Design a protein around this ligand. Structure first.
Ligand code: HEM
Ligand SMILES: CC1(C)SCCN(S(=O)(=O)c2ccc(Oc3ccncc3)cc2)[C@H]1C(=O)NO
Ligand SMILES: [Zn+2]
Ligand SMILES: [Zn+2]
Length: 467
């Protein structure tokens, strides 16, 4: 069939000069408006197809799910112990190694707490610590990002590592620091080159600085894993994912095919931990920013929290069903924050058809989630913070199909169930006991965030006064 349209490619650079990597989301909007919902790009040697809108993304990830569940190979990951039976989950290639960790991560989380009141109470406990930390700032203006990252990170640590860390633990802080730095490494020109030419890694000079943060991250994590291997009580049912993983490694000794091995234990755990320390807290960072930028909405939320929960009892997942306005606000924060605009790259394993065009095997697929979350054809005021995007005239919460912050298909975020719970409990817990606002004498903060693979709100301070 006919391949997707797109800007005319240069001789060797291809379309590298037709894409503004400073604000790619905007550049792609222009391309979408110019060539359509499914267009092509030749980034150097990598053929790319961008998917815009719910339909294009869905036909690829759901309808053609089997053929689009693979990731682009990333040979550089070798530096972290990645191998055929050791791929973690996020960067894992479509196959048994992924499926085994995928199924394991999903079911273990569910067994450990997800969907039960135990996790809720654990989270609201961590929430209480978060509140107390906010209170230490008295009326003084501060940046909530660090405390949000620490509190959220403790929830995933509890699940994976069976413990939390004090907001000032050196190892905890270093772990969080390295995790955020390495999120800068995933976006480097050098990595692209070494990735195309695997052999170039034999030069210690290069290999030695390519993924230094991810390596530091894993190294720092090994120390924690080693202590855990020591405290673990195999005579009791696993308390966390690391123990569950460990018990599987026992059962799997002698099985060359099992992905439950030492190399993969640090990758899987680092996979879940890192993912959990940089997603939800960012959304929460957007949440608090939007709440000081729209005090009215913040009050409506507090009002609902008062009417349904009060200012005593700790929030509970059972409350959400009776808090449609707060649920709408949270969903809008996710929609507007648009924290993962271009999603995570996919790769076709077979030739497929999308919106009439043909997408050859091996094509790097880009799911433009931002275009689904800001689709002017679907949302009323896509470029505005508008809780009514998830509310009907009656005040009922409705979730449109264009709400794909987590993508779709067999590869969709496995942390969604955890994210849903964290956002509700942490958000209501914060607004239930605090009142946020822009610090007098300071300019209204921008609702425009700084572009990256993971989009954070622009730096800002706020005042948190008790209630
Ligand atoms: C509000 C927060 C979050 C957002 C917006 C988000 C978004 C995403 C997106 C866009 C993907 C890619 C889906 C695809 O490949 O098409 C994904 C993947 C993934 N996320 Fe998240 N995520 C969030 C939270 C977390 C959390 C809390 C965890 C849990 C540890 C997590 C774990 C993962 C994992 C393991 C994958 C890879 C799944 C696979 O390839 O099979 N994420 N997420
Ligand atoms: C275990 C690894 C160190 S292996 C090498 C790469 N990373 S990473 O720290 O660079 C990273 C962190 C967050 C991220 O963003 C996410 C995740 C989930 N949902 C939405 C966004 C992407 C990549 C770790 C990894 O695979 N995590 O999943
Ligand atoms: Zn444990
Ligand atoms: Zn209704």
């Amino acid at each position: 069939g006919k391949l997707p349209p797109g800007p005319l490619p240069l001789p060797g650079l291809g379309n590298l000069l037709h894409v503004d990597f400073q604000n790619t989301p905007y550049c792609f909007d222009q391309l979408r408006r110019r060539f359509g919902d499914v267009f092509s790009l030749q980034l150097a040697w990598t053929p790319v197809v961008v998917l815009n809108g719910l339909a294009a993304v869905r036909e690829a990830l759901v309808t053609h799910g089997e053929d689009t569940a693979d990731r682009p190979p990333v040979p550089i990951t070798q530096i972290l112990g990645f191998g055929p039976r050791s791929q973690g989950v996020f960067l894992a290639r479509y196959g048994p190694a992924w499926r085994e960790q995928r199924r394991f991560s999903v079911s273990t989380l569910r067994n450990l707490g997800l969907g039960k009141k135990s996790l809720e109470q654990w989270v609201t406990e961590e929430a209480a610590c978060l509140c107390a930390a906010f209170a230490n700032h008295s009326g003084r203006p501060f940046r909530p990002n660090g405390l949000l990252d620490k509190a959220v990170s403790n929830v995933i640590a509890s699940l994976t590592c069976g413990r939390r860390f004090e907001y000032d633990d050196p190892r905890f802080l270093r772990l969080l620091d390295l995790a955020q730095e390495g999120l800068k490494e995933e976006s480097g020109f050098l990595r692209e080159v070494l990735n195309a030419v695997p052999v170039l890694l034999h030069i210690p000079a290069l290999a030695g600085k390519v993924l230094r943060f991810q390596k530091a991250f894993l190294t720092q994590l090994d120390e924690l894993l080693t202590e855990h291997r020591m405290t673990w009580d195999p005579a009791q049912p696993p308390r966390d994912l690391t123990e569950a993983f460990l018990a599987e490694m026992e059962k799997a000794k002698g099985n060359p095919e099992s992905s439950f091995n030492d190399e993969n234990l640090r990758i899987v755990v680092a996979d879940l931990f890192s993912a959990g320390m940089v997603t939800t807290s960012t959304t929460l960072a957007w949440g608090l920013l939007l709440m000081i930028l729209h005090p009215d909405v913040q009050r409506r939320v507090q009002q609902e929290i008062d009417d349904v929960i009060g200012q005593v009892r700790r929030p509970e997942m059972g409350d959400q069903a009776h808090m449609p306005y707060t649920t709408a606000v949270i969903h809008e924060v996710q929609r507007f924050g648009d924290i993962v605009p271009l999603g995570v790259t996919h790769m076709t394993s077979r030739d497929i058809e999308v919106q009439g065009f043909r997408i050859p095997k091996g094509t790097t697929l880009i799911t433009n989630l931002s275009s689904v979350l800001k689709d002017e054809a679907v949302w009323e005021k896509p470029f505005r913070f508008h809780p009514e995007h998830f509310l009907d005239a009656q005040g009922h919460f409705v979730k449109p199909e264009a709400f794909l912050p987590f993508s779709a298909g067999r590869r969709a975020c496995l942390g969604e169930p955890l994210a849903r719970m964290e956002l509700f409990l942490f958000f209501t817990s914060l607004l239930q006991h605090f009142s946020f606002s822009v610090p007098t004498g300071q300019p209204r903060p921008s609702h425009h965030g700084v572009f990256a693979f993971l989009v954070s709100p622009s730096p800002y301070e706020l005042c948190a006064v008790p209630r």
